[PDB]
Amino acid sequence: KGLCLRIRDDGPGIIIVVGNEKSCKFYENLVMKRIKWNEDFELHTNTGDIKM
RNA sequence: AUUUGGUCAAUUUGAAUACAGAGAUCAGCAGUUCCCCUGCAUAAGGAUGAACCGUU
């Protein structure tokens, strides 16, 4: 249970996560260790693929 | 100088029959315990993956 809100798409936003403790821990791990947020990526659109 | 270490049992008896006394050998498999591997389940506990936006 929870959510992920954010401002203006590109802007800063909040994840809230709620549940059983193990699950929460797992989620945290995913957020921090597994995902690389600073990593570069590609946006796919009809006009052209935008490198970010 | 002599002699004991020498009684077959069993059965039929009121000595005769018996005659030494009645399964062997070879081979499987399973179980018992411990160990190792393998697949599955059960709990727990990780690790990780997967496009893209979601819900009043």
Q: What is the DSSP letter of A11?
A: S
The 3-state DSSP class for residue A36 equals: coil
CB within 7 A of strand B (chain A, 1-52): 4, 22, 25-26, 29, 33-34, 43-44
| 3-state helix, strand and coil shares in percent for chain A, rounded to the nearest 5 | 25, 25, 45
- The span from the first CA to the last CA of chain A, in angstroms, equals 30
C1' (B27) to CA (A6) span, angstroms = 82
β-strands A42-43, A13-17: how paired? unpaired
Tell me the residue length of chain A: 52
How far apart are the C-alpha atoms of A40 and A37, rounded to whole Å? 8
Q: How far is CA A18 from CA A24, A25, A29, A34, A44, in A?
A: 7, 10, 14, 19, 32
CB A6 within 8 A of CB A13: yes
Count other C-beta atoms under 10 Å from residue A28's C-beta. 12
Method for structure elucidation: cryo-EM
Extract the runs of DSSP E, i.e. beta strands, from chain A. Answer: 2-6, 13-17, 42-43, 50-51
